[PDB]
């Protein structure tokens, strides 16, 4: 996350870190059930001789705050047993960029490990709404991934403006969240993590999934996220959540 700040300990208990063998943190995910994580499909495409599409090559860390303290009380380490990328994921356009990850062994709820609620198909997060991206991704373009989990307050942008800022690249599955003055944005290695909508009432829904951007934190180029509501029935159907 660019232009964000340190999360407070245990403030985002659904945020997960996905480590690939030999690489440390690579992608984000979201705890939705004791057995299931929601992440971005494009994180599990074989690349550079490494088989990212292969569950066995991944470790998931839950209740993690600080990448240099993975043995902290609260952290739960879980192997994956399955990866289910959306069948319409297109790695050329990034359309339908969502995936479900099955844990080998169930997460255990705690002060540091708690699930986030899924939105109904009908759920709407209107233009101008202040929401949240979290992650351990780079803190600048071409920079270094945060050790402490980062949070960024960003605002929904309307789909007409979105399509205009990113012509020929925005599909109905996508939403722009951010600012036109850039500055605060998702970046590399935030992908697959939660876009979190925190309501004034205390309820917390997952608006979307970190997908892509044209660079990070650039003027007129806000991050693009997969819209979660569209996938409710696809999630119920394949996971049972």
């Amino acid at each position, epitope marked *: 996350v660019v232009g964000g700040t340190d999360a407070d300990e245990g403030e985002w208990p659904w945020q997960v870190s996905l480590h690939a063998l030999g690489q440390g943190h690579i992608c984000g995910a979201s705890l939705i059930s004791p057995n299931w994580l929601v992440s971005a499909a*494009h994180c599990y*495409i*074989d*690349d*550079r*001789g490494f088989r990212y599409s292969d569950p066995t090559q991944w470790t998931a860390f839950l209740g993690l705050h600080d990448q240099s303290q993975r043995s902290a009380p609260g952290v739960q380490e879980r192997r994956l047993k399955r990866i289910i990328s959306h069948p319409f*994921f*297109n*790695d*050329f*356009t*990034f359309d339908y960029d969502i995936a479900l990850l099955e844990l080998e062994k169930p997460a255990e709820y705690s002060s540091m490990v708690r699930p986030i609620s899924l939105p109904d198909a009908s759920h709407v997060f209107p233009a101008g709404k202040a929401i949240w991206v979290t992650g351990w991704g*780079h803190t600048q*373009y*071409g920079g270094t991934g945060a050790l402490i989990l980062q949070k960024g307050e960003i605002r929904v942008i309307n789909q007409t403006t979105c399509e205009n800022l990113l*012509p*020929q*690249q925005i599909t109905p599955r996508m939403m722009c969240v951010g600012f036109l003055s850039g500055g605060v944005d998702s*970046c*590399q290695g935030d*992908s697959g993590g939660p876009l979190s909508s925190v309501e004034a009432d205390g309820r917390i829904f997952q608006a979307g999934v970190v997908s*892509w*951007g*044209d*660079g*990070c934190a650039q003027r007129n180029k806000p991050g693009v996220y997969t819209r979660l509501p569209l996938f409710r029935d696809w999630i119920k159907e394949n996971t049972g959540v």
Partner: antibody
Amino acid sequence: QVQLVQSGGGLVKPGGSLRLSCAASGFTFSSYAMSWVRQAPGKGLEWVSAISGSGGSTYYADSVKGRFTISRDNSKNTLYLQMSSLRAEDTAVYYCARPYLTYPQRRGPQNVSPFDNWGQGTMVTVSS
Amino acid sequence: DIQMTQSPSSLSASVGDRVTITCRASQGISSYLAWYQQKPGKAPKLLIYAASSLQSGVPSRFSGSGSGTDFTLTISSLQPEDFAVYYCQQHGNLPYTFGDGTKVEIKR
């Protein structure tokens, strides 16, 4: 340095078939969608086909849809194009080409790019 | 299917001259317009992307401007090695479509 070394080509009778090759080196091949672009003798440039980095998604220009097949082997760092049902109008030089990425240090879709590196070209002559 | 149209079809200019070529798209393309340089027997070479951005290692006398449907490549000061066919390409939609080409010959 980034290189795209092509091979293949030649003379093929109409209706016949051919496989063009592009061997890539100097960058992470698998991270890059690729295209084949052609140029008829004395004529302009025509985009022919494209493939995402994974091999998952493929596109073709109309004049060539159904007759051609673009594919890739990321373990050999090579791009392929199978041409079939070859007509006279397919006679041309075929280049392979890599997309120009504006911000390569974050991953994203590659559908809006012109082409920064090109192979040397492969002449294909269709004739009886 | 976007049609790209180039003017003039060919031209002749003197070393040191300013040269200006025009490209026209049949529908708007935002800024997704590129300019290539093709020398005989060689592959096209990327000069300009996104209408006005100069590829690195490309000489400073090459420059582009424009938006939507209407684009210009300028060579501020023509050099002999600038002999070539110059192509515009739209880089927005599939099929990516090239202009028909502007042949620049040197006048000597």
